[PDB]
Amino acid sequence: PGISSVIPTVLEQSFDNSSLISVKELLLNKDLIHPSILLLTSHLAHYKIVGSIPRCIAMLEVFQIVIKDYQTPKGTTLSRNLTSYLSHQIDLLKKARPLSVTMGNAIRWLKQEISLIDPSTPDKAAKKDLCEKIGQFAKEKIELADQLIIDNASTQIEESTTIVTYGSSKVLTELLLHNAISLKKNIKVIVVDSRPLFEGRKMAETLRNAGVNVMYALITSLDTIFNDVDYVFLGAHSILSNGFLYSRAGTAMLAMSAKRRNIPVLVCCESLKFSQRVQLDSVTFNELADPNDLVNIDYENPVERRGNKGALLNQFIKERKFEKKKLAMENKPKGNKIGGKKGSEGESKDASNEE
Amino acid sequence: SIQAFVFCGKGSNLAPMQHSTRLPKALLPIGNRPMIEYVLDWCDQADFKEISVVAPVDEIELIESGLTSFLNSNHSHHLQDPKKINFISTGESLQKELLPRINGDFVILPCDFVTDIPPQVLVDQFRNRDDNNLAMTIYYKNSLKQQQFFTVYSEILLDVYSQRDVTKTKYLQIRSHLLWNYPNLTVSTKLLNSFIYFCSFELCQLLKLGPQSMSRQASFKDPFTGNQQQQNPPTTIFILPNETLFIRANNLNAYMDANRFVLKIKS
Amino acid sequence: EDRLQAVVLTDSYETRFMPLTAVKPRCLLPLANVPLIEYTLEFLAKAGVHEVFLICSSHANQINDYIENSKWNLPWSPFKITTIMSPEARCTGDVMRDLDNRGIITGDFILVSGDVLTNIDFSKMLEFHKKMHLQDKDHISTMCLSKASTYPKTRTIEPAAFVLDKSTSRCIYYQDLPLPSSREKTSIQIDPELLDNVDEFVIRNDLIDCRIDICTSHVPLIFQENFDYQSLRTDFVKGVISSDILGKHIYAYLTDEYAVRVESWQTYDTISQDFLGRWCYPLVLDSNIQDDQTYSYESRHIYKEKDVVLAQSCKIGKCTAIGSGTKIGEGTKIENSVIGRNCQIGENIRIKNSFIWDDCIIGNNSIIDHSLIASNATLGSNVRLNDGCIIGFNVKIDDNMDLDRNTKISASPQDLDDQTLAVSIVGDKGV
Amino acid sequence: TSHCRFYENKYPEIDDIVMVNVQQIAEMGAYVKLLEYDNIEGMILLSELSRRSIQK
Known part of the structure; x- marks a missing residue:
């Protein structure tokens, strides 16, 4: 999984509702993690520019990239371990830094999408329309919303x-x-x-x-x-x-x-x-x-x-x-x-x- | 996405060991621990999966044998022998040959290494700071004449000029356009180059079309010049080299330094 | 450390300020209502000088009068001012030689060249100098250096190059280059004699010129010995470095605080802008050093003196100054400009990054964009100016005039465009 | 300059089909330019447009 616990600074008497620390320097990582997620984590750890809105967009882009890179295996189906992977990613993100409501919403949407398309359609045809749909969604609830x-x-x-x-x-x-x-x-x-x-x-x-x-x-x-x-x-x-x-x-x-x-x-x-x-x-x-x-x-x-x-x-x-x-x-x-x-x-x- | 190239050749600069038919440049006992042992350790630390070692005309199977027997390795190492090597051409001609095998970013690390510095932080720097090329310089031996000059920046940490004292005019010369853009240029005398090179994705295009590089130094970092005329086609991020300084006693071998390394190793 | 004497080089870079200097001199001119020598005097006082030497040549009588009028001729001060007489337009070496011939100096002396406004505490520097002297016998002068503003891209006039040391701090080489105005030279040559004795080298070009020297009792003797030197920065220090006297060394010092010298118009403008902003901390107008001044800091970067008359319905911008006794009518769209003491204003002036000196009468309707108005020069009706325009002394601008970029206006009642008398470049009249 | 009808006449008939490229929305519905019959604007009210997220 990586590194857990052992951190400087006291727990503090005042304000201790959330956990305070997480990985920043990469050492012993799993041989299945997509580098874009890692890079994002590295960025967020010490970021100056982004805040709520662009972060979500970036996340969406990353997800799209992952989808593009993903292909259906011979043994396991399209909906078999993808959800698990997503969960793992979420856990990593949380470990790095607490997340927003928009991100959660996006995750929910993704989950819904996963359920919607049944594992029977051609694999190449599936992701072709998926990425288009996701793009459309992005255009709608972000760019168009911004315009509005x-x-x-x-x-x-x-x-x-x-x-x-x-x-x-x-x-x-x-x-x-x-x-x-x-x-x-x-x-x-x-x-x-x-x-x-x-x-x-x-x-x-x-x-x-x-x-x-x-x-x-x-x-x-x-x-x-x-x-x-x-x-x-x-x-x-x-x-x-x-x-x-x-x-x-x-x-x-x-x-x-x-x-x-x-x-x-x-x-x-x-x-x-x-x-x-x-x-x-x-x-x-x-x-x-x-x-x-x-x-x-x-x-x-x-x-x-x-x-x-x-x-x-x-x-x-x-x-x-x-x-x-x-x-x-x-x-x-x-x-x-x-x-x-x-x-x-x-x-x-x-x-x-x-x- | 992640890969490393290991340079190997033949000992020509060294005086006393290398001229033997069975003993290679990669496999040399200097101070108990082997020469390619350290490199292998470094690679392991760096978490690189696919590492391909480039070999000279001399020794074709000995290196393979070394890789296999005696040593922990636990990695799929491939040893390849290209044909176009003349030496009179160290590794640039090898680099030119092997380019379609590169999928992402590649790291150049020669067979000869004496290392003590932390390995992760170079890689991390290369990743983060959005730069195409990164090189390392280390202090001269402090334990009890014409040498070499290198340029450094202190705040971002950049490299500009790297030329040696072998073949040049009697007076040291600086360009005007190379000075006005990026104003601060610290020139050090004590620093020695460890020959560690980091390369990004966009480098494969220039080598196949126009070769000018000599000893992997001439046309590698110096043709970053976007000044005066601009008559060379660039690949797009602007072309900028970088440099970082380190304290620990770890340097290159070329002359009579082997005997000093022996002295160092036992501590 | 007690009992110190200082020599100040005033009136040296004339004709460089080409539109001005005809009746009134260079150093006497004000930055923002207050003269440039005043700051220097203040600095000297802070340092602790007991004997002040000042050099005057061109328009010297007026300078002398000003000195007399200043609060230093009276015996309350530890220092007294003595004037050095010299022929019109001379090098810095001749003056030095003259000084040597006269003979006053015992120990350490301060030589300041040009006009310097600085806020650095100097006692520490002095101490450092003393310590370094105590190290070794053969040591001469101390130099000041400061980090440049962002990047040297707007600063084209000053291309100062320095080669320095980390351990002992010593200068080696100086070089100047044009570059963006004229692209010609691409070569600089460095001395190969001494390298391994120093080991550490830090070469820097992004440094502001100061030209301040703290000197020991060797310099005048040296000048007497070798009379080929003309200037102290260009030939002298370099000469000293390149085996003039074997074993002698010089100092370099670095400070992050604001210290810029005046030499060109753009630089002056930049300095003024800096002053308008809160960059200077000991040198703010609200403190009032001159005691006659009654300036107070106000909101939105606006400087104001006591008793200012201003009419209803007006809009103000950023980084502005208004002097006392100003009679201002309706209009005034003021942005980034200094206005002198006692100025009568008619109606409507559109101001964008302008500049006005002491005692000026502006008539009706004028659109001014980035230009300077000198002392006792009056503006009539319909005035329109472009970027980087300079107006000289006593210029009586009448009715209807239009001027473009880099138009210089004369001060003498000789070589440059626009005459001081009636109508400028619409009817040629005058001498 | 780009103008003129596509088929035969400037004005469309009854029951015929037309393709529209929408520029601006949300006031009455969509009064936008045509691609099947000339460049003259054609309008839909906010009821006939919907068959079954309406703005997006």
Whole structure:
């Protein structure tokens, strides 16, 4: 199977809902694992760019590739060990890093597809139509959905607007690009970034590469830029069946600020991002990473410096724990643009029954 | 997807052992442990399944015998003998010959090796950083004149210039276009090349059409130049070589270094 | 370490700033409302100089007057300023020779060439220098180096090359190349004499020029001995290296902090931009070093002094500065520009990356895109300018004018286009 | 320039079949250009289009 247990850093007295560590350096691997999965795992382990949306697409692509490479054996049938393989892959993924609802949905869809086609049809003809179908699905629930979202944004966003964004959600970046080049509008895009992740920075860079006026913002200096700000979009990850946004980093604070100061908050989301599972706080299900990211002085990601920090077990009780994903409130984000055009966050799972 | 090529030849540079008809360059006892033992260990560590060893005109079955008897191996090793070898041509002519057998990425590792460094981290680096070529340099012997020069970068870690002091003009010369793009260029004197080479998927096209390489160094990493004129057809990721430094005492054998290696081995 | 003396080289790179320097000199000019020598003076004060030597030649009287007006002639300061007289347009060697002939120096002395604005704490550097001196007898000068901004692609004027050491830090070779403006040369030659004695080599080209030297009592003697030298950076250090006196060594030092010298227009602009941003930490306008200044930092990177009049309905951009006593009417779309003290403004100016110096009167309707306006020069009606335009001293721009890229405007009331008097390139008038 | 009818006449008849390439959707239904009879737009209302995921 690989490597299990034996990890640095304590279990911690505060916040221990999920397991904290997993394979990063490859040693003794099974002689049946597809390299693309391994590469993906390697990437995710230390990624800066992707967040929720592109990850799922990547996964889908990988799956497609696997299917293309797969052929029906003489002894075992098409539906004999494929499911087992999928399960193994899932387990590997989980071991690497906790997964999203979209991925789960995709898995479910795949499972359904497996059941649908009966093991009697010609093998070459089977996968030919399968990969086409999967492509079609991808086009529909992602690209077309993105387009729909863009169009929704278009009718709502006024002439000459100031937008404040967080994270590295691809859809928002696409929207901003559209605003810049295709429609041609006056845009002021303020992007906020945190210590361990340089997603905001990346977004800013991307904007620059197009030709947009960008203000770089931080958590320490928030109130100075608001007091002027008209419209705020948040980096969406998943909407729960209560009306709460399970999202990345200090978006909740921003939302609170928005609520305090005049204008309501807006959220752009996909039709398949919705979850039937329910939770109402950050303590419920936390996504964790290694405290090794916050040791060095900032500036850039790879530095390797000698200074003062570099003790987790050496000094007299030192805990340096952080959270990657937090909870955003219910009443504060009201706007939701999805595959079913219009709706609010109070409307929690009306689209879930409609599918 | 994963494969390695093992280079073998004949001892010409060495003075005292190699001129014997029965003793090959691959199978040599230097310090108790055999020469190809270390290489085999490295390969095992690297988790490569299909490894094909290229052989010279001299010794056709001895190498096979070595592979078979005495040594743990537990791997499907194939020993092949191409015809176009003249020596006056080390391995480039072999490389040119064997190209349809390559399915993915290939690693070049000669028969002569003295190794102590961690093997996985080179491979991992090659995989991750999105680069076509990677090479290694190690410190000179510190235990109690004209040598060789190599270029290094420190932050990404890149290689640019690699030419030796054998045949060149009296004054050292640098190009203008090669300096303006990538501004920082650290030149070291102490570092010695261990001749470890990593190759990506897109390398097979150039060898069959236009051969210019000599001793696997002349036209291998230096024709990365996308400057001044651009008159050579590239394969697409831009052509960039890389280099990494290591501390441990492990180097190449060519001159009177064998006797030093003997001294080293016993510790 | 106590009691130090310093020599500052002022007025050296004239005609390089071609549109200006006709009545008023080069060093006296302000960066953002405040002169370039002031920063140098501040730095000197920080260091702890007790005797200041300053060189003046062209437009020297005005410089002297300025010095007199500055708060250093009064006996409260540990240092006093003495002026060195020299003929118009000279090399740095002659001045050095003159200084040697005069004879004042006892021990360590600081020689600063050009105009340098720096924020580095120098006591540590001094200590290091002392320590290195204590190592071996035959040692001369200390050099400063800093890491370049991103990549040297916009910096075409300065192509400074350095060959360095890790263990003891010593320079070897210097080279300059054009490249993107003119593609001609592809060859650089390096000395093969000393290699195995040093072992470690770090060759770097991405380094900002500073031209600051901390020197011992050897340099003037050396200059006296060999009178073939003209400049300190190009010929001298290299000469010293290439077996001039056997056993003598020089220092190199690296600092990550901001230190850039002024020589060209684009570089100056870049420096100004940097200043506008929060790159400099000890050198911010809100602290007010001159005491007469009353600047305060505000939101959206806007600098403002006390008492500024501005009319209703106006939009502002990023990285801007507004001086005191400015009477501004309706309009002003201000983006990335410095405006001097006391400026009367009519109506509507579209500003994109512009620059305005002290005391300027702008009339009605002007679209300005990336250009500089000098002191006491007035703008009339209908002014439109392109990228990289420089306007000289006392230029009275009247009615209706259009100019394109790289158009230079004269300062003298001699060789360049656009005259100071009535109408520029629509009716040739003047001397 | 690309225009003109495919068969004989510009206007289609009764019970005949036509192929359509859809550009934009969701307002009335689909009022899009034809490939079997000329380039003049033909419309479907949001009821006759569905036989048995409707938007996707």
